[PDB]
């Protein structure tokens, strides 16, 4: 079948499922639960000054929170600057040639703060952000749900 376990495999972990499918499922969970803190600036700000227009998705902040949660899972000890390199893009300068610009650290600071309020991430000892035990459990449990095709 499509969701049957492959032989001796049982359970699931992050990186065993589609990254986007996990992120969208986490974003849906964050919105459905309703406990996550959403800044009022997300309704008018852009994700980065390198972007040309607004994020165009009503739930873009929940998706960004899920994306940074997955990023902190992959690389413990990451900071706002390290996350900015992940979500940067190429800026259009008009008649001048294009250049890579890192993402704004404002939304990344807000996203980490929202996750810390939920208890999923904590300030890592000696700089950076890290996933809590609850955060690691949340990521793996949702990864299994994605594999089972449960979603929300």
């Amino acid at each position: 079948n499509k969701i049957h376990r492959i032989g001796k495999r049982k359970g699931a972990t992050l990186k065993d499922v589609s990254a986007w499918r996990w992120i969208k499922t986490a974003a849906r969970h964050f919105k459905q639960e309703g406990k996550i803190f959403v800044p009022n600036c997300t309704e008018i700000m852009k994700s980065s000054h390198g972007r040309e227009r607004a994020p165009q998705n009503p739930d873009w902040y929940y998706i960004r929170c899920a994306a940074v949660l997955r990023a902190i899972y992959l690389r413990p000890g990451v900071g706002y600057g390290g996350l900015s390199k992940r979500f940067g893009n190429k800026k259009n300068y008009g008649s001048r040639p294009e250049h890579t610009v890192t993402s704004s650290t404002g939304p990344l600071h807000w996203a980490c703060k929202s996750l810390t309020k939920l208890g999923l991430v904590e300030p890592g000892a000696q700089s950076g952000q890290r996933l809590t035990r609850k955060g690691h459990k949340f990521a793996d449990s949702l990864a299994f749900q994605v594999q089972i095709r449960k979603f929300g």
């Binding site: 032989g7 001796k8 495999r9 990186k15 065993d16 589609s18």
Partner: protein, 143 residues
């Protein structure tokens, strides 16, 4: 029991893929911790899958292969990874099987594609002054 482990590598441009092949309970191949069916795009997934399909999955029966690829781009890493997987199977059979079946596997790999086992020697040609690239000279004007 005994470990029964083999480590190989594959190269493509600046990409270097190191594959660790271990006897395990079940076949499990991951590239940078990502399962084969989660590798994107599907075109590059099929290229990596060539290291298994051209010889058949029966020779990867109980092999756990972990491939760590660093350097290069997405396409270069995929070619380095598939070469590392193919060389890992051949080296595993070299170390823990007799020559007849290892030679059969090597012959099948070479029959399909040379670069499954032999690294592509091509590298970026250095830029020279007076040129915008390795060979593109500056534009010459007369009048």
């Amino acid at each position: 029991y005994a470990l029964k482990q083999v480590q190989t590598f594959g190269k493509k441009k600046t990409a270097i893929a190191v594959a660790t092949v271990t006897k395990a309970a079940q076949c499990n191949i991951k590239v940078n911790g990502v399962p084969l069916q989660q590798i994107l795009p599907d075109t590059l997934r099929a290229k990596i899958m060539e290291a298994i399909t051209v010889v058949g999955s029966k020779y990867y029966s109980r092999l756990r292969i972990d491939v760590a690829v660093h350097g290069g781009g997405q396409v270069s890493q995929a070619y380095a990874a598939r070469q590392a997987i193919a060389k890992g199977l051949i080296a595993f059979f070299q170390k823990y099987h007799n020559e007849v079946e290892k030679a059969a596997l090597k012959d099948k790999f070479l029959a399909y594609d040379k670069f499954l086992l032999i690294a592509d020697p091509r590298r970026c040609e250095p830029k020279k002054w007076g040129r915008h690239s390795a060979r593109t000279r500056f534009t010459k004007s007369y009048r």
